[PDB]
Amino acid sequence: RLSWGYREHNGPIHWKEFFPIADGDQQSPIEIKTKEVKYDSSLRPLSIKYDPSSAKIISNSGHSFNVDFDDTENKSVLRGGPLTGSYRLRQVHLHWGSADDHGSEHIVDGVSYAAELHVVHWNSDKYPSFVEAAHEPDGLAVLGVFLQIGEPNSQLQKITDTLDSIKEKGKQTRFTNFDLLSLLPPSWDYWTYPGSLTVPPLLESVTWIVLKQPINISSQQLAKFRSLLCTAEGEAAAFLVSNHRPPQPLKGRKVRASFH
Numbered sequence: 646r647l648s649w650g651y652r653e654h655n656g657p658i659h660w661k662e663f664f665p666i667a668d669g670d671q672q673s674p675i676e677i678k679t680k681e682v683k684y685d686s687s688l689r690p691l692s693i694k695y696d697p698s699s700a701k702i703i704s705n706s707g708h709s710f711n712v713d714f715d716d717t718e719n720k721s722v723l724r725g726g727p728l729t730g731s732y733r734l735r736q737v738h739l740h741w742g743s744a745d746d747h748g749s750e751h752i753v754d755g756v757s758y759a760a761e762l763h764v765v766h767w768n769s770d771k772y773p774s775f776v777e778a779a780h781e782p783d784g785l786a787v788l789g790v791f792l793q794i795g796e797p798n799s800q801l802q803k804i805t806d807t808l809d810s811i812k813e814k815g816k817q818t819r820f821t822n823f824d825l826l827s828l829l830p831p832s833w834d835y836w837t838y839p840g841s842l843t844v845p846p847l848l849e850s851v852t853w854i855v856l857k858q859p860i861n862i863s864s865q866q867l868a869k870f871r872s873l874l875c876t877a878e879g880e881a882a883a884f885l886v887s888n889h890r891p892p893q894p895l896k897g898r899k900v901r902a903s904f905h
């Protein structure tokens with residue numbers, strides 16, 4: 646189905662109707678139970694080379710905002726941690742809920758955060774395209790960053806300044822010179838597990854790298870993402886007030902930690 650969303654009749658619970666992998670064995674997001682998580686000394690240092698001129702556009706997909714990056718070069722790449730080879734930056738988006746008390750996709754020892762930032766990368770060492778890589782178990786790597794309610798994050802301004810211009814699904818605007826690096830928290834300690842896209846088609850192609858340390862967002866900043874529409878110009882307006890999928894069962898998978 647081309648009309649999945651987060652409303653009552655198209656939301657997460659209904660996605661299994663058209664995407665039965667929703668009930669798969671490597672579905673994301675998940676709950677992270679820290680007492681069960683083992684530190685893995687075989688994890689290499691996480692290496693993050695990001696070039697601000699890589700960013701090209703921001704658009705409203707109807708499901709989030711998407712910052713798209715020029716990904717035919719290795720100017721912005723994620724290496725190390727659990728990864729074999731170079732994963733090229735593709736895009737950035739965000740998940741939130743209708744209220745500040747929850748809205749993260751991953752939930753850590755019962756704790757949810759206000760929002761969760763995802764940085765999507767694809768294995769250009771093996772696959773010809775993001776689209777192809779999305780269908781391979783080792784094709785994608787997504788870095789998740791929790792956002793907790795806190796004093797305002799000046800590093801979100803480039804993004805929040807654009808939201809009016811992309812109110813309607815399908816809108817896009819020029820977006821370059823984007824300091825993605827500064828959106829990350831100081832500490833890059835993370836958990837990692839094999840999982841999926843958190844959005845249809847829910848492909849089980851993602852090495853998840855979920856950072857332990859949250860960054861801040863104010864309640865005022867976060868409210869602005871909720872006045873995005875999930876509807877296109879000329880369609881009955883509906884607001885994108887929540888766009889997060891619930892944690893799915895581990896089903897035997899084990900979460901590893903970069904740190905002890």
Ligand SMILES: NS(=O)(=O)c1c(F)c(F)c(S(=O)(=O)CCO)c(F)c1F
Nearest residue numbers: 711736763765787841842843844845
């Ligand atoms: N929540 S998630 O990180 O799993 C995620 C997205 F939500 C997402 F929209 C994309 S996409 O790049 O925009 C198109 C493939 O779905 C992704 F590639 C992707 F990985």
Ligand SMILES: [Zn+2]
Nearest residue numbers: 738740763843
């Ligand atoms: Zn996401």
